[PDB]
Amino acid sequence: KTVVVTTILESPYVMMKKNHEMLEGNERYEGYCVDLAAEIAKHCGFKYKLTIVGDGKYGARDADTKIWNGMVGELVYGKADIAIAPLTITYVREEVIDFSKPFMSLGISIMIKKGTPIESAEDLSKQTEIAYGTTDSGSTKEFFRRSKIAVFDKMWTYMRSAEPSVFVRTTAEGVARVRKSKGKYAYLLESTMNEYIEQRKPCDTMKVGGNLDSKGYGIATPKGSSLGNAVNLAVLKLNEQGLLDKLKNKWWYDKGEC
């Protein structure tokens, strides 16, 4: 049976090919995760269908309804068999779904419009002029909401009450906000995305400071899935073979426009 792969439209992980309107199925997409999915499928010997997550979210549990959304929800409720995307491995997610060992390492970082007088999370927490926020329904927002660390707690206290909302629905929306805010908005997103955008026209944004944490992305499967073991080994193999490093260079720097 064809394996249903849930993923998210997030450059450069999954993107629409130039002539996608003339293409069908998996041929409509290109990107790091499109390439990765092919490698994993070949190694695990299965056929698959890439499907873009319906609500366009990574995945969080509704504190009220206790219902999971995004890619996590699609796995939890049986809509998809596996998730291949820049989905972060976290405690609350590991409680409901399985994750392979990481295929990419990263951490939350700060994106600023070049020239913005900010160099750290501490800087952001101390000032009021420059607003800052994160993407909704993901591990980054949960990071600040749950942090007991002084700096991050202060930032969360501010973000949770900010008006207008400093939270964005997608990475693209956040990038646009940084670029159009004349330096009055800083965006908290993972290092992977930050460094990617840093290499794309108009080259007006940049990553400042070190990462706030260290974590990774994992391929996810519903709890008890029979695909789990083989996928985990496939990831480890592809990494040791240097394929993952090649894919990173391919989509991040070989095509860099800055």
Ligand X SMILES: Cc1onc(O)c1C[C@H](N)C(=O)O
Q: Which residues are annotated as a binding site?
A: 86, 88, 93, 139-140, 190
Q: Interface mask (CB under 8 A) for its own copies, residues 93-132, using x and -?
A: -xx---x-xx--x---------------------------
Residue with tokens 């809509």: 79
Per CB under 6 A, does 133 bind ligand X?
no
Per CB under 6 A, does 109 bind ligand X?
no
Per CB under 8 A, does 49 bind its own copies?
no
Per CB under 6 A, does 193 bind ligand X?
yes
Min dist CB 236 to its own copies, Å, is 4
Cβ-based nearer residue to its own copies, 177 or 215: 215
CA 30 – CA 43 distance, rounded (Å):
19
CB of 46 closer than 8 Å to CB of 82: no
Longest C-alpha distance within the chain, in Å? Answer: 55
Cβ-based nearer residue to ligand X, 9 or 43: 9
Min dist CB 148 to its own copies, Å, is 7
Q: Interface mask (CB under 6 A) for ligand X, residues 196-235, using x and -?
A: ----------------------------------------
CB of 111 closer than 8 Å to CB of 206: yes
Q: Which stretch binds ligand X (CB under 6 A): 61-69, 85-93, 155-163, 249-257?
A: 85-93
Cβ-based nearer residue to ligand X, 34 or 189: 189
CB of 11 closer than 8 Å to CB of 31: yes
Per CB under 8 A, does 257 bind its own copies?
no
Closest-by-Cβ residue to ligand X is 138
CA 135 – CA 133 distance, rounded (Å):
7
Per CB under 8 A, does 149 bind its own copies?
yes
CA 222 – CA 24 distance, rounded (Å):
27
Min dist CB 35 to ligand X, Å, is 17
- Interacting residues with its own copies (CB under 8 A): 89-91, 94-95, 99, 101-102, 105, 143, 146-149, 213-216, 218, 232-233, 236-237, 239-242, 244-245
